[PDB]
Subunit: 111 residues, 4 copies
Amino acid sequence: CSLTGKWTNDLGSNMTIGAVNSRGEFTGTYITAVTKESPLHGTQNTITQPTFGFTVNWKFSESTTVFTGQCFIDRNGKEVLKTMWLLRSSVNDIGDDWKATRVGINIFTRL
Amino acid sequence: KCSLTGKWTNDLGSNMTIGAVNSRGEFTGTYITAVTATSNEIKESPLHGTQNTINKRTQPTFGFTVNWKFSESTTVFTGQCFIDRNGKEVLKTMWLLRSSVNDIGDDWKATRVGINIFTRL
Amino acid sequence: CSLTGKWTNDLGSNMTIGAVNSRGEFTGTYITAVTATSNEIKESPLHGTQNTINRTQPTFGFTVNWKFSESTTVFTGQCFIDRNGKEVLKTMWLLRSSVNDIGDDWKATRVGINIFTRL
Amino acid sequence: KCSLTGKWTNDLGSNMTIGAVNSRGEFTGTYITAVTATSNEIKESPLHGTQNTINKRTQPTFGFTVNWKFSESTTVFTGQCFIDRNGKEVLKTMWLLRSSVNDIGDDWKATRVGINIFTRL
Ligand SMILES: *[C@@H]1O[C@H](CO)[C@@H](O[C@@H]2O[C@H](CO)[C@@H](O)[C@H](O)[C@H]2NC(C)=O)[C@H](O)[C@H]1NC(C)=O
Ligand SMILES: CC1(C)CC(NC(=O)CCCCC[C@@H]2SC[C@@H]3NC(=O)N[C@@H]32)CC(C)(C)N1O
Ligand SMILES: CC1(C)CC(NC(=O)CCCCC[C@@H]2SC[C@@H]3NC(=O)N[C@@H]32)CC(C)(C)N1O
Ligand SMILES: CC1(C)CC(NC(=O)CCCCC[C@@H]2SC[C@@H]3NC(=O)N[C@@H]32)CC(C)(C)N1O
Ligand SMILES: CC1(C)CC(NC(=O)CCCCC[C@@H]2SC[C@@H]3NC(=O)N[C@@H]32)CC(C)(C)N1O
Ligand SMILES: *[C@@H]1O[C@H](CO)[C@@H](O)[C@H](O)[C@H]1NC(C)=O
Ligand SMILES: *[C@@H]1O[C@H](CO)[C@@H](O)[C@H](O)[C@H]1NC(C)=O
Ligand SMILES: *[C@@H]1O[C@H](CO)[C@@H](O)[C@H](O)[C@H]1NC(C)=O
Ligand code: NA
Ligand code: NA
Ligand code: NA
Ligand code: NA
Ligand SMILES: [Zn+2]
Ligand SMILES: [Zn+2]
Ligand SMILES: [Zn+2]
Ligand SMILES: [Zn+2]
């Protein structure tokens, strides 16, 4: 169960994760189906079914999304990425901060 | 302007140091949490994240991952670099703390959520 | 898309939502299919309200008062209709664990989703 | 010893009043939000929740829904009643704000999250 490869989630978004170095660091591109491509950066815990997390630095909005989850192996043997994300929006005054963070899930399978 | 480069501390007492943010918003840093839950020892862990460059906002959004060096878990933060009314820089963040579970059926319980406020140290 | 009825979620949990009165208030029971405690699962009550402002697909929220654990879970979502006319309860929940000292609060809340269909 | 009955105020400046908590831990009350993002005039809204009764812990957990009367949204709070070193009662809570979207395809963006700290008013 390694994050490298092409992934697709329930919303139809695509994700491509490059190589994961010894420290667990990886890069990739994120193709969002709902709102376009944007780079992503994250690391995977090193110490089989590891936990991971990455940031998606969007290039068509001021927002930032972070994903985190675990690489599982289904009963049938397929790799499944079960993750949750926080989508931070850009507010002007810090008084509007209470409404800036959304939350949700995404399930990825090998594209 | 509010830049993440610097040394920060949050309401739990954890300390965070963020290096330089390059022309694309990518940065790296270390995280020294004040709290834990594992049987192992607390250790300065690396963090990798990015800062939004769209419009070069003076209060941009950001998000980074903390790859813990003593726990099997992973934590992701995201928030906004804010400038107070007095003029002090403050980070308003929310984090997800993914736990490691061997059963994919145990996945429903492997994600904690919380907040964190950061100021310069 | 009324909440009244019996529902089942992706985790295999069942919940029966009684009648929703004029103000949107409703009561019911929740039979969770999963737990990590050592205690035996036990049907627990739920109390929640439904938004009446204006709808075909209203937003709602309800608390589950667990009777076998010291914790508390709250759900909130929207009643949707599919392309095949099927009712779906898309929800997210916050699971509050009981901690000893307020200092241990940071690690007390879990988060997740649950999709419901009529049983 | 830490009961939710009484009038509370949060870090945002909002106020709520929690009536009586019965044997089963059920309770109702009122919530007057201090902030909002709709131009509709903020209108006092009812709330329904329940307190955990297992073991009658001095610091129980709780949750309640707030049925907004001036918006199509719903917010759920869950937390714990604490007694700090000083002796004051505090409510540590996290909330989900479910927005009303038209189609089920917009559902992914209909739930916000945050915290609130309440102290007796
Ligand atoms: C939710 O309800 C369904 C149906 O009412 C339950 O399904 C039954 O589960 C038992 C347990 O193994 C089986 O022996 C029955 O054959 C099932 N019946 C049907 C019609 O499927 C289900 O167990 C309930 N879930 C929980 C957690 O109680
Ligand atoms: C709510 C919304 C639309 C959020 C902001 N969206 C964007 O900027 C588009 C880029 C992010 C969308 C991808 C998310 S990310 C998690 C989820 N998982 C997945 O695969 N796609 C989705 C824009 C503003 C703030 C204006 N509004 O508010
Ligand atoms: C044991 C297990 C599964 C793992 C725990 N991981 C740790 O102990 C590593 C220490 C770093 C975490 C610090 C968090 S990170 C966000 C917040 N902000 C801050 O500064 N500290 C806290 C976690 C849990 C409780 C899930 N359990 O217990
Ligand atoms: C830490 C842990 C394992 C988690 C919590 N476990 C419980 O609360 C007991 C089981 C009842 C909760 C059912 C949830 S609710 C959302 C999800 N959706 C669904 O259908 N079931 C699940 C708290 C404590 C600390 C007791 N334990 O220990
Ligand atoms: C504008 C719209 C569609 C509706 C908004 N609904 C409202 O205006 C109704 C009242 C808001 C409740 C106040 C929250 S509740 C948790 C927190 N604790 C507290 O005391 N206040 C805040 C919501 C948003 C802006 C998301 N969307 O966009
Ligand atoms: C994802 O990849 C598949 C296969 O290449 C393609 O059919 C689909 O259109 C892609 N979706 C997006 C949003 O790029
Ligand atoms: C953070 O730094 C300050 C000053 O350098 C120090 O007093 C404090 O103990 C540090 N906290 C942690 C958790 O390392
Ligand atoms: C909450 O109560 C205080 C106490 O007087 C009051 O000043 C404040 O206006 C109240 N909040 C709102 C939103 O009315
Ligand atoms: Na504003
Ligand atoms: Na298990
Ligand atoms: Na403690
Ligand atoms: Na739409
Ligand atoms: Zn990059
Ligand atoms: Zn690294
Ligand atoms: Zn009850
Ligand atoms: Zn009511």
